[PDB]
Design an enzyme around this catalytic site. Structure first.
Site, mmCIF file in Angstrom:
data_model
loop_
_atom_site.group_PDB
_atom_site.id
_atom_site.type_symbol
_atom_site.label_atom_id
_atom_site.label_comp_id
_atom_site.label_asym_id
_atom_site.label_seq_id
_atom_site.Cartn_x
_atom_site.Cartn_y
_atom_site.Cartn_z
ATOM 1 N N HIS A 55 9.907 0.384 25.252
ATOM 2 C CA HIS A 55 11.215 1.045 25.031
ATOM 3 C C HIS A 55 11.699 0.705 23.627
ATOM 4 C CE1 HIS A 55 11.786 1.073 29.649
ATOM 5 N NE2 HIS A 55 11.282 2.244 29.237
ATOM 6 N N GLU A 58 14.451 -2.001 22.667
ATOM 7 C CA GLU A 58 14.383 -3.374 23.178
ATOM 8 C C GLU A 58 13.631 -4.146 22.110
ATOM 9 O OE1 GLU A 58 12.756 -2.845 27.159
ATOM 10 O OE2 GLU A 58 14.249 -1.415 27.697
ATOM 11 N N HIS A 163 10.228 -6.772 27.719
ATOM 12 C CA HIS A 163 11.364 -5.831 27.816
ATOM 13 C C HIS A 163 12.672 -6.561 27.651
ATOM 14 C CE1 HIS A 163 9.490 -2.005 29.592
ATOM 15 N NE2 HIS A 163 8.457 -2.856 29.643
ATOM 16 N N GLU A 216 11.422 -9.670 31.100
ATOM 17 C CA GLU A 216 12.632 -8.996 30.710
ATOM 18 C C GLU A 216 13.522 -10.067 30.159
ATOM 19 O OE1 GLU A 216 14.402 -6.074 30.891
ATOM 20 O OE2 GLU A 216 12.942 -4.791 32.028
HETATM 21 ZN ZN LIG Z 1 12.517 -1.770 28.939
#
Ligand SMILES: [Zn+2]
Ligand SMILES: [Zn+2]
Lengths: 241, 241
Positions: A55, A58, A163, A216
């Site tokens: 993404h 990020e 992430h 994450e």
């Molecule tokens: Zn992500």
């Protein structure tokens, strides 16, 4: 404990703007940027793949992984590293690639469909409702296609994907690598989150039996990432699982 | 105060992954990515230039500017917008471009020299000591060359440039625009910081009499940027100075 294990020896801070490993291109983005990876330098049976930038917004994890990579003596690198697999989304400041495709909904998993989905505008927005594309049924996004051929070619033993901002280590299989990661980054482990969603990279990996862990980070700036977690990334780059 | 001025009317949140303005390329990066700007949509005498991504790892401002741009009805855009002028450094997670050149030390200012300089590893590192290049005396970096032709061609009345993480609005000339920015972003104004350094964009602009304000966000994540400052970016995109 008899002694504290040795501090990692690092490239001197003054020299860290350079990349001592020349990357190899594995493809081209929609806009025509090169897709780059830094090949592992150590021969071993457990060589895997460390990845960020699925993404495009990020970026704390891209900065941390890039700073870690440039801090590590070149000959210590055990795994292939992709600093960002979605370079167009980085320059566009978007989650999705340049065709408005969420790349984590765009892998050709068994259950992939052509219908779009929605992502969350910001971490305190109450619902996911930002519409986003999941891909063309006739043709993979080029960033997906390219990462898939790279994995085919290099055969990593595992992938760790970074992430933000959910603040957890997502473990597909009660594994030690995920426990080790939760301890390194000081984040709780959750078990099997998003490993069934059509087109997710975790779904895609599970279908191939490829261990895939997602870290994450919480919503933290790049500066705090470098200052709190640099060692955790550097460790990972040298880690035998 | 007789009534609260009206809330800005915005593209619905659900539609914000799209860019309703097709950008125009103004050049190519070292690695061959396109350099993009979104042209102003309103005709006016005060059209200027809003810019981010001089340093590739200062991404909270790229995300905020990109989210603002995609939140604004297309016909309300008064200024040209460059989401990132250094797309290679974004995918590499580096401050410097792909030749290890700090682009804010690479403009052809009168006092520019070929000697390298040093930047600070992270905001709490006590000294600047990370060595970084300032450019080739025979040839501009392509991201610099391209931004310079764009400014030549479009003639903005002013530039606002976004950085991180110094937490201040850097005003070259005791100006209202800088005061308005400090109030919008809730940041203190400082006066004349780095507008004399060889190759800085502020130095370069002062030599041409071009008003150039730098907003340095604090070290904040992209998520907090969207949630605390979105309106401040959106306002700026429609602002008459
Ligand atoms: Zn992500
Ligand atoms: Zn900067």
């Amino acid at each position: 404990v008899l002694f504290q294990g040795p501090a990692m020896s690092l490239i001197p801070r003054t020299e860290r703007a350079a990349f001592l490993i020349t990357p190899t291109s594995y493809g081209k983005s929609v806009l025509g940027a090169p897709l780059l990876y830094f090949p592992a330098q150590v021969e071993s049976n457990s060589r895997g793949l460390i990845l960020a930038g699925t993404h495009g917004d990020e970026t704390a994890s891209i900065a941390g992984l890039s700073c870690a990579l440039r801090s590590l003596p070149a000959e210590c690198l055990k795994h292939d590293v992709i600093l960002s697999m979605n370079p167009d989304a980085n320059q566009l400041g978007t989650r999705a690639n340049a065709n408005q495709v969420d790349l984590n909904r765009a892998f050709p998993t068994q259950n992939w469909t052509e219908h779009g989905t929605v992502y969350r505008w910001s971490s305190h927005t109450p619902v996911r409702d930002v519409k986003v594309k999941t891909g063309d049924k006739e043709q993979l996004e080029p960033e997906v296609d390219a990462l898939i051929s790279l994995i085919e070619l290099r055969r990593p033993k595992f992938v760790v994907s970074f992430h933000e901002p959910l603040a957890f280590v997502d473990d597909p299989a009660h594994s030690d690598l995920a426990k080790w990661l939760g301890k390194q980054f000081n984040l709780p482990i959750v078990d099997d989150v998003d490993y069934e969603t059509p087109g997710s990279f975790g779904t895609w990996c599970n279908e191939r039996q490829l261990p895939c862990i997602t870290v994450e980070l919480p919503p933290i700036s790049a500066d705090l990432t470098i200052e709190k977690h640099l060692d955790a990334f550097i460790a990972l780059l040298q880690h035998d699982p």
